[PDB]
């Protein structure tokens, strides 16, 4: 994990696979697809040590990955409008839903792959 310091004790995991959300729409599907690269392929999250349920973590990891991008524009330009944010609310979602599970299989066992 490339655990960024500019976080309130959250981490940074690994690169993922930018999903294929269609939003149940034709235009959202397309607009996302045409721009899917602009969004991160990663997420930020606190450790599952203080969690239990998908909602709690996913809700945080939404707000966090979104804002950390929508705030990183204060040193970049990634300002992400409401339409971009709604894409992110699903993109960082699927990433975080996975990201949870990845660590849930490394917090439950004591991390002993030996």
Curated annotation (Swiss-Prot):
Disulfide bond sites: 61-96
**Sites where a glycan is attached:** 63, 79
Query: Where is this protein found?
Result: Cell membrane; Golgi apparatus
| Description of the deletion phenotype | No visible phenotype. Mice develop chronic demyelinating polyneuropathy after 60 weeks. Mice show abnormally low iron levels throughout the body, and are mildly anemic. Iron accumulates in duodenum enterocytes, suggesting impaired transport from the intestine to the blood. Mice deficient for both Prnd and Prnp have the same phenotype as mice lacking Prnd; they are born at the expected Mendelian rate and appear grossly normal and healthy. Females are fertile, but males deficient for both Prnd and Prnp are sterile, in spite of normal mating behavior.
PTM: N-glycosylated.
> Which tissues does it occur in?
Highly expressed in the brain, lung, kidney and heart. Expressed at low levels in the liver and spleen.
Record annotation: effect of changing residue 72 to V: Linked to long incubation time; requires 2 nucleotide substitutions
What residues show lipidation of type GPI-anchor amidated serine? 113
What role does it play?
Its primary physiological function is unclear. May play a role in neuronal development and synaptic plasticity. May be required for neuronal myelin sheath maintenance. May promote myelin homeostasis through acting as an agonist for ADGRG6 receptor. May play a role in iron uptake and iron homeostasis. Soluble oligomers are toxic to cultured neuroblastoma cells and induce apoptosis (in vitro). Association with GPC1 (via its heparan sulfate chains) targets PRNP to lipid rafts. Also provides Cu(2+) or Zn(2+) for the ascorbate-mediated GPC1 deaminase degradation of its heparan sulfate side chains.
Q: What is known of its domains?
A: The normal, monomeric form has a mainly alpha-helical structure. The disease-associated, protease-resistant form forms amyloid fibrils containing a cross-beta spine, formed by a steric zipper of superposed beta-strands. Disease mutations may favor intermolecular contacts via short beta strands, and may thereby trigger oligomerization. Contains an N-terminal region composed of octamer repeats. At low copper concentrations, the sidechains of His residues from three or four repeats contribute to the binding of a single copper ion. Alternatively, a copper ion can be bound by interaction with the sidechain and backbone amide nitrogen of a single His residue. The observed copper binding stoichiometry suggests that two repeat regions cooperate to stabilize the binding of a single copper ion. At higher copper concentrations, each octamer can bind one copper ion by interactions with the His sidechain and Gly backbone atoms.
Protein family membership: Belongs to the prion family.
Q: Which disease is it linked to?
A: Found in high quantity in the brain of humans and animals infected with degenerative neurological diseases such as kuru, Creutzfeldt-Jakob disease (CJD), Gerstmann-Straussler syndrome (GSS), scrapie, bovine spongiform encephalopathy (BSE), transmissible mink encephalopathy (TME), etc.
Summarize subunit and interaction data from the UniProt record for this chain: Monomer and homodimer. Has a tendency to aggregate into amyloid fibrils containing a cross-beta spine, formed by a steric zipper of superposed beta-strands. Soluble oligomers may represent an intermediate stage on the path to fibril formation. Copper binding may promote oligomerization. Interacts with GRB2, APP, ERI3/PRNPIP and SYN1. Mislocalized cytosolically exposed PrP interacts with MGRN1; this interaction alters MGRN1 subcellular location and causes lysosomal enlargement. Interacts with APP. Interacts with KIAA1191. Interacts with ADGRG6.
Q: What's the protein called, per UniProt?
A: Major prion protein
Specify the species: Mus musculus (Mouse)
Full protein: residues contained: 120 to 231 of 254
């Amino acid at each position: 994990g490339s655990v960024v310091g500019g976080l309130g004790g959250y981490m940074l995991g690994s690169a993922m696979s930018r999903p294929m959300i269609h939003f149940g729409n034709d235009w959202e599907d397309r607009y996302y697809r045409e721009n899917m690269y602009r969004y991160p392929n990663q997420v930020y999250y606190r450790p599952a040590d203080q969690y239990s349920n998908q909602n709690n973590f996913v809700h945080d990891c939404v707000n966090i990955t979104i804002k950390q991008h929508t705030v990183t524009t204060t040193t970049k330009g990634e300002n992400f409008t409401e339409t971009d944010v709604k894409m992110m609310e699903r993109v960082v979602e699927q990433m975080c839903v996975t990201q949870y599970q990845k660590e849930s299989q490394a917090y439950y066992d004591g991390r002993r792959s030996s």
